Amino acid sequence: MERYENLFAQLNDRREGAFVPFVTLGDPGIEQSLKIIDTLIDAGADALELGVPFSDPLADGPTIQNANLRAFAAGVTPAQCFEMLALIREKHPTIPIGLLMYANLVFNNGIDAFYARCEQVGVDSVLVADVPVEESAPFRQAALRHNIAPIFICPPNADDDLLRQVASYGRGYTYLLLHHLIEKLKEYHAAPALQGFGISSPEQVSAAVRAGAAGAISGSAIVKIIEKNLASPKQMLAELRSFVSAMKAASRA
Amino acid sequence: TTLLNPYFGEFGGMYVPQILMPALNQLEEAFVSAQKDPEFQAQFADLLKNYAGRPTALTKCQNITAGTRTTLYLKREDLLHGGAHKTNQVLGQALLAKRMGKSEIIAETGAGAHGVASALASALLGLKCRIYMGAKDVERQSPNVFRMRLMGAEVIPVHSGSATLKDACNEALRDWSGSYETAHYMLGTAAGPHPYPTIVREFQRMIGEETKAQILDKEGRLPDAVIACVGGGSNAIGMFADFINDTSVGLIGVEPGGHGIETGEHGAPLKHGRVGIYFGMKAPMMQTADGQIEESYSISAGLDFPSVGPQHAYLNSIGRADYVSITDDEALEAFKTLCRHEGIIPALESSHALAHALKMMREQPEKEQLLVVNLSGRGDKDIFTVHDILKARG
Ligand SMILES: C=C(/N=C/c1c(COP(=O)(O)O)cnc(C)c1O)C(=O)O
Ligand SMILES: [Br-]
Ligand SMILES: [Cl-]
Ligand SMILES: [Cl-]
Ligand SMILES: [Cl-]
Ligand SMILES: [Cl-]
Ligand SMILES: [Cl-]
Ligand SMILES: [Cs+]
Ligand SMILES: [Cs+]
Ligand SMILES: [Cs+]
C-alpha cells in the first residue's frame, strides 16, 4: 500500500506537519493497549510507531525499558502483538502503522517470513533499531519485497555518505535523530523527514516543521503519560487525548 | 565501510544503532594504526612484562596424570597481575583509548575479573573508569566490587531487565552511544560488534604464542590439543589464535553445561543454542522459540553468558575447533583435584577446561597425548562458593 505517501500528500495539501506517537504494544496490557492506541488515533495521531516487547532493548532509555517490562509482566509475546496489529488495522484502514523492532525478533524465524507477516496484518514500515545501513541489505530487501517501507535513522553525527545511503535506502519517512541535514536529505530525494529527537512539547513540533521537516515523532512522551497514570485507566486515556491534540494542533502551524 | 572484515563466515558484524557506528569505525582505525606502530607495541609489551608479569609460567602437572599416557601442562594465566587473563587485553584497550585521546573508560563485568582488570588499568593509566555490573551481580561479588572501588572505579548496579551480565552489557552500550566522544567502551570478551572480537583476540594472542614457544622448548613438538573454557571466548581465542594454522593441533573449547544440557540450565549456546542477533553480533544465542534472549546458567559467574564470540562459531562451523561442555559437578571435581594434587587453586571457569582434559585422559588412559589447559584464572574468588557447596553436599 501507499499509506505514508497518501498521508504526506494530504498533509502537503493542508500545509500541515505529521505528528506520530510511539507506544509499546501490550503496555500495560493487551486490552488497555488497544484502548490507548484507539485514543491516540481519535485524538489526531497521523501515524503510529509501535514497539514489540523484546528481552534486551539495548537502544531504549529507561522510559521504554519499563514499558517493555510492563508488557512482559502482562505476558505479551510477538505473536500476540501481531494479533493486535491485525485488529488495529481492521479498525483503522488508512493510518500508517510502523513497527520499531529489534533485529533478533525479525531474524528469529526468518527475515522474509517476518516481513510477510507484517504485510499480512497491514503494517506499513519497520525500523530495526540495531541494524545500521551497513548491515541492512537483507532487511531492506525483504521489506521492499513485501511492500513494507524500511525506516532508517539519520543520527546527529551523520556524514554525507550516510545521508546518501539513508536517502537511497529508506522509504516512508526518514527518522531524524539542523538545516543542512534536512535540505541535503531533500537534495537526495529521501523519504520525508520526521524529527524524532526529544519531541515532548507542542512548540517542538512547530519548530520541526519550520525547519523543513515533514513533521515529528514523539518517541517517549506518550509512554511517560501511561507510566504516570497506571492506577487511573480513566485519567490515562484523558491525558493521552489532551496531549496528542495539542501536539497535532502545533503541526497545522 | 570498514578496513577489516567484520565477519567470520556468517558470524559477527556490527549490529548496533546507527549512532554508534562512528565510534566503532574510529576504534577500528585506531586499532589498525596501533598494530603498525612500533611505539604502541613497545608500550604494550612494557606493561605486559613489568606491570602484569608476562610471560606466565607453563606448568607440567605430573601428579594428576600419573599412570596414564597423558602429559598435561597448565598455562598459568592465574599468575598474571589481577589473577586472570583479562588483564592482557585491558592493558591494550586502555592504551588504545589513550591513543584516541579518550579520558574515560566504560566496562561491563559479571564475575568481576574484567571489572577489576579495567579498574586496575584505569588507575595505572589515568583514566576515569565506570563499571556496569547489574544488581544481581553487584549484590554478590562484594569482594570484586570493593576492589574495583578500592582502585578508584565507579561501580554502577544495573536493575534493568534480568539485572545481570547481559543487561550490564546493555547499559554499557547505552552509555557509550552518548559518551563515545570522551569515553572508550572496554568490552571484556571476544564478542560484541566488530571490531571487538578482532581486537580482543589480538590483545590476548600472546597466551598461545608463549604456550607454543614454551611447549617447543620443553617437549620439542606442538601439543596434540589446547583446551580452554569459553564464556564470551577471549581466553580461548587468545590460546587458540597462534595455533589455528598448525592443523595438527586440536583446539577444544569448553562451554558450561550447568546442571546438564538436558535441563536447559546451561551456558552452551555454541552447541546447544541457535544463531541470533544481539549485543551487536550475529552469533549462537540461547533464546526462546520466539527469539527472546534466554537466561544462561553456570556455577561459574564468568561463563554465565547466553552467547559466544563469532570467531568460535566460525571455527566450529568449519571443523577447525571442537566445542564440548562440562557440568557444574565435573568442574567442581576438577577444582578439588587440582588443589589437592598440584597445589593450584583454579578459577571455577578454568576448572571447566581442566575437567575436560581430565576426561580426555581418564576415558582413554593408554592414549598418548600432550595437552595444554589454559588456566585462565585463580580461584580465590570462588573459595566461598565452593565452601558452601561442599558444606551443603556433606
Ligand atoms: C565474564 C568475566 N569473566 C570471565 C572469565 C572467563 C570467561 O571469559 P572468556 O570466555 O572471555 O575468557 C574465563 N576465565 C575467567 C577467570 C573469567 O573471569 C568477567 O570477569 O566479567
Ligand atoms: Br538444551
Ligand atoms: Cl484510519
Ligand atoms: Cl530507536
Ligand atoms: Cl617464532
Ligand atoms: Cl590432534
Ligand atoms: Cl578434530
Ligand atoms: Cs527514497
Ligand atoms: Cs603421565
Ligand atoms: Cs557461554
XYZ file of C-alpha atoms and ligand atoms in Angstrom:
677
model
C 0.000 0.000 0.000
C 0.938 3.695 -0.098
C -0.245 4.780 3.347
C 2.695 7.083 4.036
C 2.700 8.607 0.557
C -1.038 9.249 0.804
C -0.625 10.752 4.257
C 2.173 13.083 3.215
C 0.216 14.152 0.147
C -2.830 15.016 2.299
C -0.624 16.902 4.771
C 1.198 18.724 1.949
C -2.214 19.678 0.585
C -3.197 21.026 4.023
C 0.204 22.705 4.669
C 0.450 20.500 7.703
C 3.056 18.622 9.721
C 2.718 14.959 10.675
C 2.541 14.079 14.364
C 3.449 10.454 15.140
C 3.339 8.945 18.677
C 5.272 5.870 19.833
C 3.817 3.279 22.205
C 4.917 -0.226 23.229
C 2.338 -2.874 22.169
C 0.654 -4.518 25.153
C 1.805 -1.825 27.614
C 0.349 -2.039 30.249
C -1.709 -4.935 28.900
C -3.370 -6.022 25.662
C -6.843 -4.549 26.149
C -5.597 -1.329 27.738
C -3.045 -1.087 24.926
C -5.751 -1.412 22.265
C -7.763 1.330 24.008
C -4.673 3.534 24.389
C -3.962 3.167 20.675
C -7.571 3.955 19.730
C -7.362 7.105 21.870
C -4.166 8.253 20.139
C -5.839 7.883 16.739
C -9.081 9.569 17.839
C -7.043 12.476 19.216
C -5.376 13.100 15.853
C -2.232 10.976 15.501
C -1.247 10.974 11.820
C 0.588 7.644 12.075
C 1.687 5.197 14.756
C 5.035 3.794 15.753
C 4.585 0.584 17.729
C 7.187 -1.348 19.694
C 7.168 -5.116 20.091
C 8.451 -6.078 23.610
C 11.964 -7.524 23.494
C 14.034 -9.026 26.306
C 17.032 -6.740 25.707
C 16.117 -3.338 24.134
C 19.677 -2.001 24.002
C 18.684 1.149 22.067
C 15.996 2.270 24.536
C 16.222 4.591 27.540
C 14.554 3.933 30.951
C 11.068 5.081 29.957
C 10.745 2.425 27.285
C 12.702 -0.232 29.177
C 9.937 -0.201 31.786
C 7.259 -0.115 29.130
C 8.670 -3.448 27.907
C 8.760 -4.774 31.455
C 5.119 -3.827 31.979
C 4.242 -5.675 28.747
C 6.238 -8.819 29.633
C 4.638 -8.698 33.075
C 1.301 -8.931 31.223
C 2.539 -11.966 29.233
C 2.833 -10.129 25.889
C 4.515 -12.091 23.049
C 5.368 -11.101 19.430
C 2.562 -13.380 18.249
C 0.086 -11.538 20.470
C 1.463 -8.239 19.102
C 0.696 -9.400 15.551
C -2.866 -10.257 16.598
C -3.207 -6.740 17.952
C -1.824 -5.269 14.765
C -4.418 -7.049 12.638
C -7.206 -5.761 14.922
C -5.846 -2.205 14.820
C -5.668 -2.179 11.021
C -9.113 -3.794 10.727
C -10.422 -0.760 12.655
C -8.296 1.946 11.038
C -7.694 1.340 7.326
C -5.655 4.384 6.313
C -3.440 5.303 9.263
C 0.227 4.360 8.631
C 1.480 1.818 11.156
C 5.228 1.471 11.686
C 6.944 -1.036 13.943
C 10.031 -0.415 15.986
C 11.790 -3.785 16.130
C 14.936 -5.368 17.468
C 16.898 -7.407 14.966
C 16.610 -10.752 16.720
C 12.776 -10.674 16.574
C 12.940 -10.016 12.825
C 15.657 -12.602 12.168
C 14.256 -15.277 14.582
C 12.038 -17.256 12.317
C 13.398 -15.956 9.015
C 13.644 -12.374 7.799
C 11.361 -12.921 4.764
C 8.707 -14.589 6.903
C 8.753 -11.640 9.344
C 8.095 -9.080 6.636
C 5.470 -11.387 5.072
C 3.558 -11.403 8.390
C 3.905 -7.600 8.548
C 2.351 -7.360 5.093
C -0.424 -9.807 6.008
C -1.521 -7.781 9.051
C -1.239 -4.438 7.225
C 1.886 -2.839 8.762
C 3.434 -0.102 6.603
C 7.016 0.239 7.857
C 9.681 -1.372 10.050
C 12.529 0.366 11.837
C 15.043 -2.170 13.122
C 16.773 -0.293 15.935
C 20.065 -2.286 15.927
C 20.525 -2.689 12.177
C 22.655 0.177 10.764
C 22.553 0.879 6.993
C 25.797 -1.068 6.660
C 24.076 -4.289 7.786
C 20.660 -3.518 6.339
C 20.621 -5.232 2.928
C 18.599 -8.391 3.770
C 16.170 -6.402 5.887
C 15.620 -3.704 3.266
C 15.263 -6.282 0.503
C 12.720 -8.347 2.431
C 10.817 -5.194 3.455
C 10.512 -3.980 -0.145
C 9.507 -7.424 -1.440
C 6.558 -7.336 0.971
C 5.527 -3.703 0.370
C 6.938 -2.598 3.752
C 8.933 0.623 3.990
C 12.334 0.136 5.671
C 12.890 3.110 8.017
C 16.391 4.374 8.766
C 17.723 6.666 11.455
C 19.695 9.690 10.310
C 21.673 10.484 13.507
C 23.143 13.880 14.516
C 26.667 12.544 13.812
C 25.661 11.726 10.182
C 28.096 12.408 7.300
C 27.444 12.849 3.554
C 27.962 9.173 2.620
C 25.451 8.218 5.309
C 22.983 10.860 4.067
C 23.125 9.416 0.539
C 22.625 5.819 1.752
C 19.724 6.738 4.028
C 18.219 8.750 1.183
C 18.606 5.869 -1.272
C 17.627 3.010 1.056
C 14.763 4.337 3.182
C 11.081 4.653 2.304
C 8.012 6.006 4.053
C 9.914 8.519 6.150
C 13.421 9.227 7.415
C 13.800 9.091 11.177
C 15.760 12.236 12.052
C 17.994 11.880 15.142
C 19.957 21.236 11.501
C 19.033 22.863 8.178
C 21.933 21.086 6.440
C 20.526 17.629 7.247
C 17.002 18.468 6.136
C 17.869 20.189 2.834
C 20.522 17.589 1.998
C 18.014 14.778 2.574
C 15.702 16.634 0.207
C 18.556 17.123 -2.268
C 18.971 13.339 -2.342
C 15.182 12.747 -2.686
C 15.000 10.965 0.666
C 11.724 9.846 2.233
C 10.126 12.843 4.078
C 11.985 13.577 7.325
C 10.290 13.231 10.708
C 12.146 14.863 13.604
C 12.263 12.352 16.472
C 14.755 13.957 18.876
C 13.235 14.571 22.329
C 9.865 15.714 20.943
C 7.759 16.487 24.048
C 6.253 19.973 23.608
C 3.821 21.463 21.024
C 6.456 24.069 20.143
C 8.999 21.379 19.174
C 6.513 20.127 16.574
C 6.152 23.662 15.187
C 9.958 24.046 15.232
C 10.450 20.788 13.332
C 8.020 21.752 10.549
C 9.554 25.255 10.383
C 12.999 23.628 9.996
C 11.664 21.987 6.822
C 10.791 18.564 8.247
C 7.562 16.791 7.317
C 6.583 16.505 10.989
C 7.637 14.986 14.305
C 7.730 11.709 16.188
C 7.236 11.788 19.940
C 9.428 8.850 20.883
C 8.874 8.648 24.658
C 6.484 11.380 25.877
C 3.392 9.201 25.335
C 4.890 6.331 27.308
C 5.634 8.789 30.120
C 1.903 9.605 30.263
C 0.992 5.899 30.508
C 3.625 5.496 33.223
C 2.218 8.302 35.391
C -1.399 7.058 35.318
C -1.183 3.259 35.723
C -3.678 3.219 38.614
C -6.065 5.596 36.778
C -7.216 3.957 33.466
C -9.606 6.912 33.056
C -7.131 9.805 33.563
C -4.635 7.884 31.425
C -6.790 7.985 28.295
C -7.830 11.539 29.229
C -4.279 12.923 29.492
C -3.322 10.939 26.379
C -6.038 12.633 24.319
C -5.203 16.133 25.628
C -1.515 15.635 24.811
C -1.976 14.338 21.260
C -4.486 17.089 20.437
C -2.012 19.788 21.499
C 0.876 18.259 19.574
C -1.254 17.829 16.463
C -2.605 21.389 16.640
C 1.020 22.571 16.628
C 1.555 20.854 13.258
C -1.081 22.929 11.445
C 1.241 25.890 12.036
C 32.690 0.568 5.098
C 35.450 -0.902 7.234
C 39.202 -1.539 7.000
C 38.940 -5.119 8.259
C 36.410 -7.902 7.679
C 33.671 -7.663 10.400
C 32.600 -11.284 9.801
C 33.949 -14.796 10.415
C 31.949 -16.606 7.742
C 28.255 -15.902 8.581
C 29.023 -14.791 12.170
C 29.908 -11.341 13.560
C 29.060 -7.974 12.029
C 28.163 -4.605 13.544
C 24.523 -4.822 14.689
C 24.399 -1.553 16.589
C 22.162 1.525 16.235
C 23.423 3.876 13.550
C 24.591 6.402 16.148
C 27.291 4.006 17.409
C 28.797 3.234 14.023
C 31.241 6.199 14.058
C 32.538 5.031 17.429
C 33.159 1.527 16.068
C 34.799 2.883 12.887
C 37.041 5.196 14.932
C 38.102 2.303 17.163
C 38.856 0.106 14.160
C 41.048 2.771 12.548
C 42.903 3.401 15.840
C 43.500 -0.317 16.296
C 44.758 -0.784 12.716
C 47.075 2.185 13.218
C 48.272 0.964 16.602
C 49.043 -2.504 15.249
C 51.506 -0.929 12.785
C 53.005 1.411 15.407
C 56.254 0.068 16.992
C 55.914 2.612 19.804
C 52.449 1.397 20.730
C 53.619 -2.205 20.620
C 56.611 -1.366 22.864
C 54.442 0.432 25.416
C 52.032 -2.544 25.458
C 54.913 -5.022 25.792
C 56.382 -2.925 28.675
C 53.125 -3.004 30.593
C 52.599 -6.745 29.984
C 56.117 -7.562 31.221
C 56.840 -5.119 34.031
C 53.331 -4.464 35.327
C 51.344 -7.639 34.661
C 54.257 -10.078 34.911
C 54.371 -11.781 31.460
C 55.480 -14.287 30.336
C 53.332 -16.545 32.503
C 54.604 -19.969 33.536
C 53.766 -23.184 31.729
C 53.453 -25.781 34.493
C 53.782 -29.528 33.961
C 51.277 -31.422 36.088
C 52.792 -34.778 36.893
C 50.684 -35.977 39.822
C 47.280 -35.697 38.192
C 48.282 -37.693 35.100
C 50.168 -40.474 36.907
C 49.541 -43.953 35.480
C 48.239 -42.633 32.140
C 49.885 -41.681 28.840
C 48.642 -38.059 29.098
C 51.158 -35.299 29.668
C 49.345 -32.169 30.877
C 50.650 -28.609 31.057
C 48.785 -25.643 32.507
C 49.303 -22.190 31.008
C 49.388 -20.093 34.148
C 47.213 -17.034 33.423
C 46.179 -17.339 37.099
C 49.627 -15.786 37.887
C 49.004 -12.623 35.845
C 48.518 -9.409 37.833
C 44.824 -9.333 38.844
C 44.587 -13.144 38.826
C 43.123 -13.725 35.341
C 43.917 -13.440 31.647
C 41.545 -10.408 31.453
C 44.426 -8.107 32.333
C 46.209 -8.652 28.988
C 43.643 -7.099 26.737
C 42.503 -4.388 29.196
C 46.032 -3.007 29.045
C 45.884 -2.904 25.217
C 42.396 -1.379 25.113
C 43.417 1.254 27.707
C 46.349 2.221 25.522
C 44.003 2.397 22.507
C 41.708 4.700 24.453
C 44.645 6.976 25.165
C 45.739 6.815 21.505
C 42.265 8.118 20.629
C 42.586 10.903 23.209
C 39.838 9.453 25.414
C 39.978 10.125 29.171
C 37.173 7.832 30.440
C 36.502 4.053 30.446
C 33.199 2.132 30.478
C 33.284 -1.616 31.215
C 30.801 -4.422 31.900
C 31.513 -7.320 34.252
C 29.743 -10.416 35.511
C 32.226 -12.253 37.713
C 34.145 -9.059 38.428
C 37.504 -10.151 36.943
C 37.186 -7.952 33.879
C 35.843 -5.117 36.054
C 38.835 -5.373 38.432
C 41.221 -5.569 35.436
C 39.524 -2.460 33.924
C 39.747 -0.585 37.203
C 43.426 -1.502 37.776
C 44.389 -0.466 34.258
C 42.419 2.754 34.591
C 44.162 3.553 37.876
C 47.589 2.935 36.321
C 46.984 4.866 33.119
C 44.990 7.859 34.434
C 41.536 7.040 33.007
C 38.267 7.648 34.877
C 36.546 4.269 34.963
C 32.885 3.275 35.459
C 31.842 -0.387 35.629
C 28.383 -1.769 34.912
C 27.676 -4.989 36.775
C 23.961 -5.113 37.364
C 22.058 -5.634 40.595
C 22.170 -9.424 40.863
C 25.906 -9.454 40.118
C 26.624 -6.468 42.412
C 24.563 -7.949 45.281
C 27.063 -10.786 45.253
C 30.704 -10.264 44.196
C 31.109 -7.778 47.069
C 34.868 -8.683 47.117
C 35.484 -7.801 43.467
C 33.178 -4.770 43.868
C 35.206 -3.435 46.779
C 38.481 -3.963 44.863
C 37.037 -2.008 41.941
C 36.069 0.841 44.256
C 39.352 0.374 46.188
C 41.013 1.274 42.859
C 39.003 4.460 42.197
C 36.409 2.971 39.815
C 32.700 3.821 39.805
C 30.629 0.638 40.070
C 27.092 1.133 38.709
C 24.473 -1.526 39.625
C 22.049 -2.121 36.746
C 18.473 -3.029 37.720
C 17.236 -3.118 34.090
C 15.740 -6.393 32.815
C 17.112 -9.536 34.491
C 19.746 -7.293 36.129
C 22.797 -9.359 35.062
C 25.774 -9.556 32.680
C 23.632 -9.159 29.523
C 21.925 -6.087 30.954
C 25.300 -4.867 32.196
C 26.361 -5.339 28.558
C 23.199 -3.492 27.511
C 23.693 -0.477 29.786
C 27.342 -0.215 28.710
C 26.271 0.080 25.052
C 23.560 2.532 26.166
C 26.097 4.752 27.953
C 28.757 4.597 25.199
C 26.426 5.821 22.445
C 26.137 9.204 24.173
C 29.664 9.421 25.579
C 31.916 7.872 22.915
C 33.487 11.244 22.174
C 35.026 11.189 25.658
C 34.757 7.545 26.789
C 36.026 4.269 25.429
C 33.952 1.109 25.934
C 36.354 -1.577 27.244
C 34.416 -4.721 26.281
C 35.660 -7.705 28.258
C 35.438 -10.609 25.816
C 35.933 -11.626 22.153
C 32.331 -10.853 21.265
C 30.126 -7.870 20.550
C 30.241 -5.813 17.327
C 33.314 -5.541 15.162
C 35.979 -4.598 15.817
C 35.911 -6.030 19.344
C 36.174 -9.822 18.547
C 39.244 -8.990 16.455
C 40.860 -6.557 18.934
C 40.333 -8.840 21.937
C 41.862 -11.796 20.080
C 44.893 -9.786 19.041
C 45.419 -8.384 22.547
C 45.157 -11.925 24.059
C 47.162 -13.832 21.447
C 50.342 -13.769 23.491
C 48.773 -16.558 25.576
C 49.062 -19.006 22.702
C 52.296 -17.507 21.334
C 54.004 -18.045 24.671
C 52.446 -21.513 25.046
C 53.820 -22.563 21.648
C 57.360 -21.336 22.469
C 57.212 -22.946 25.910
C 55.961 -26.369 24.732
C 58.551 -26.414 21.938
C 61.274 -25.633 24.466
C 60.081 -28.301 26.936
C 58.796 -31.086 24.641
C 60.285 -30.331 21.215
C 56.913 -30.502 19.415
C 53.462 -28.867 19.336
C 50.696 -30.032 21.703
C 48.135 -32.552 20.488
C 45.411 -30.221 21.800
C 44.940 -26.960 23.662
C 41.848 -26.704 25.846
C 40.128 -23.593 27.204
C 36.823 -22.621 28.754
C 34.521 -20.461 26.635
C 32.353 -17.695 28.134
C 32.421 -14.964 25.526
C 35.608 -16.506 24.070
C 38.617 -14.312 24.970
C 40.881 -16.665 26.886
C 40.137 -19.451 24.440
C 40.764 -17.396 21.324
C 43.886 -15.989 22.953
C 45.190 -19.535 23.428
C 43.934 -20.759 20.019
C 44.988 -17.925 17.698
C 48.625 -18.797 17.206
C 47.787 -22.483 16.656
C 44.990 -22.001 14.070
C 47.397 -22.587 11.172
C 49.025 -25.590 12.911
C 46.495 -28.073 11.625
C 47.712 -30.978 13.781
C 46.917 -29.094 16.985
C 43.402 -29.684 18.294
C 41.517 -26.624 19.542
C 38.966 -27.570 22.195
C 36.600 -25.033 23.734
C 34.593 -25.929 26.808
C 31.234 -24.279 27.403
C 29.432 -24.524 30.767
C 26.936 -27.333 30.916
C 25.473 -26.085 34.201
C 23.004 -28.565 35.727
C 23.185 -30.562 32.484
C 22.410 -29.712 28.871
C 19.135 -31.674 29.071
C 17.920 -29.418 31.946
C 18.202 -26.283 29.783
C 20.116 -24.692 32.681
C 23.482 -24.231 30.995
C 25.537 -21.685 29.125
C 26.407 -23.629 25.971
C 24.859 -21.689 23.056
C 27.565 -22.637 20.564
C 26.480 -26.291 20.574
C 23.008 -26.065 22.094
C 21.653 -22.661 21.079
C 20.855 -21.189 17.705
C 22.117 -18.256 15.722
C 20.532 -14.884 16.621
C 21.369 -11.182 16.562
C 22.140 -9.494 19.862
C 24.850 -7.430 21.563
C 25.983 -6.114 18.197
C 26.693 -9.518 16.631
C 25.225 -12.435 14.724
C 26.150 -15.499 16.763
C 24.759 -18.540 18.572
C 22.381 -17.442 21.343
C 20.363 -19.092 23.989
C 16.903 -17.840 23.186
C 13.230 -18.732 23.487
C 11.444 -20.188 20.450
C 10.084 -16.624 19.938
C 13.547 -15.041 19.860
C 13.740 -13.504 23.319
C 17.306 -13.814 24.658
C 17.209 -16.634 27.224
C 18.960 -16.632 30.513
C 22.036 -18.908 30.755
C 23.302 -20.682 33.901
C 26.636 -21.891 35.330
C 28.106 -22.423 38.795
C 30.864 -20.135 37.431
C 29.805 -16.458 37.091
C 32.453 -15.905 34.445
C 30.873 -18.386 31.994
C 27.262 -17.439 32.582
C 26.529 -15.728 29.291
C 23.934 -16.788 26.680
C 26.115 -16.066 23.638
C 29.665 -16.675 22.305
C 32.189 -14.781 20.181
C 31.658 -15.125 16.438
C 35.137 -16.450 15.655
C 34.381 -19.503 17.829
C 31.091 -20.077 15.973
C 33.104 -19.870 12.728
C 35.933 -22.147 13.785
C 33.326 -24.676 14.898
C 31.343 -24.463 11.652
C 34.413 -25.309 9.514
C 35.564 -28.103 11.847
C 38.776 -26.341 12.881
C 37.834 -26.221 16.588
C 35.677 -28.583 18.567
C 33.409 -27.497 21.397
C 32.202 -29.572 24.326
C 30.507 -28.932 27.652
C 31.318 -29.686 31.292
C 28.743 -29.637 34.078
C 28.949 -27.845 37.433
C 29.733 -31.156 39.167
C 32.538 -32.026 36.742
C 34.043 -28.545 37.125
C 33.859 -28.816 40.947
C 35.677 -32.189 40.909
C 38.422 -30.769 38.680
C 38.747 -27.781 41.064
C 39.224 -30.122 44.046
C 41.605 -32.425 42.165
C 43.928 -29.605 41.100
C 44.008 -28.126 44.626
C 44.860 -31.494 46.199
C 47.265 -32.981 43.682
C 49.045 -29.923 42.258
C 48.689 -27.198 44.930
C 46.997 -24.745 42.489
C 43.551 -23.295 43.229
C 41.965 -22.730 39.784
C 39.120 -20.386 38.919
C 35.842 -22.285 38.509
C 35.771 -21.026 34.907
C 39.164 -22.621 34.173
C 38.102 -25.738 36.079
C 35.740 -26.469 33.197
C 38.722 -26.674 30.837
C 40.682 -28.841 33.274
C 37.675 -31.139 33.777
C 37.510 -31.833 30.060
C 41.259 -32.579 29.896
C 40.826 -34.976 32.827
C 38.013 -36.660 30.883
C 40.254 -36.979 27.772
C 42.848 -38.683 29.942
C 40.538 -40.881 32.057
C 38.410 -42.104 29.159
C 41.449 -43.321 27.157
C 44.296 -43.689 29.692
C 46.606 -45.537 27.310
C 46.237 -42.916 24.564
C 49.451 -40.937 24.174
C 48.525 -37.281 24.263
C 50.232 -33.929 25.032
C 47.616 -31.466 26.311
C 47.702 -27.832 27.426
C 44.885 -26.400 29.520
C 44.609 -22.620 29.670
C 44.304 -21.869 33.374
C 42.567 -18.586 32.765
C 42.341 -17.505 36.421
C 42.977 -18.274 40.069
C 40.131 -19.495 42.232
C 40.469 -17.321 45.345
C 37.223 -15.591 44.275
C 35.484 -18.998 44.277
C 36.559 -20.295 47.672
C 33.388 -19.173 49.447
C 31.240 -20.565 46.625
C 32.957 -23.971 46.701
C 32.880 -23.983 50.521
C 29.099 -23.520 50.632
C 28.573 -26.339 48.109
C 30.779 -28.951 49.807
C 29.195 -27.976 53.131
C 25.687 -28.335 51.650
C 26.642 -31.587 49.861
C 28.233 -33.097 53.001
C 32.917 -12.636 32.402
C 34.026 -12.343 33.211
N 34.970 -13.297 33.371
C 35.062 -14.264 32.544
C 36.094 -15.293 32.683
C 36.207 -16.329 31.747
C 35.284 -16.436 30.564
O 35.501 -15.322 29.643
P 36.248 -15.532 28.227
O 35.490 -16.638 27.519
O 36.154 -14.199 27.509
O 37.676 -15.918 28.566
C 37.192 -17.259 31.936
N 38.055 -17.226 32.972
C 37.971 -16.254 33.876
C 38.938 -16.240 35.015
C 36.992 -15.260 33.762
O 36.947 -14.291 34.707
C 34.195 -11.107 33.857
O 35.085 -11.008 34.678
O 33.435 -10.209 33.556
Br 19.412 -27.710 25.564
Cl -7.536 5.176 9.574
Cl 15.111 3.826 18.341
Cl 58.869 -17.530 16.331
Cl 45.406 -33.704 17.413
Cl 39.234 -32.599 15.095
Cs 13.681 7.094 -1.199
Cs 51.815 -39.297 32.658
Cs 28.860 -19.002 27.211
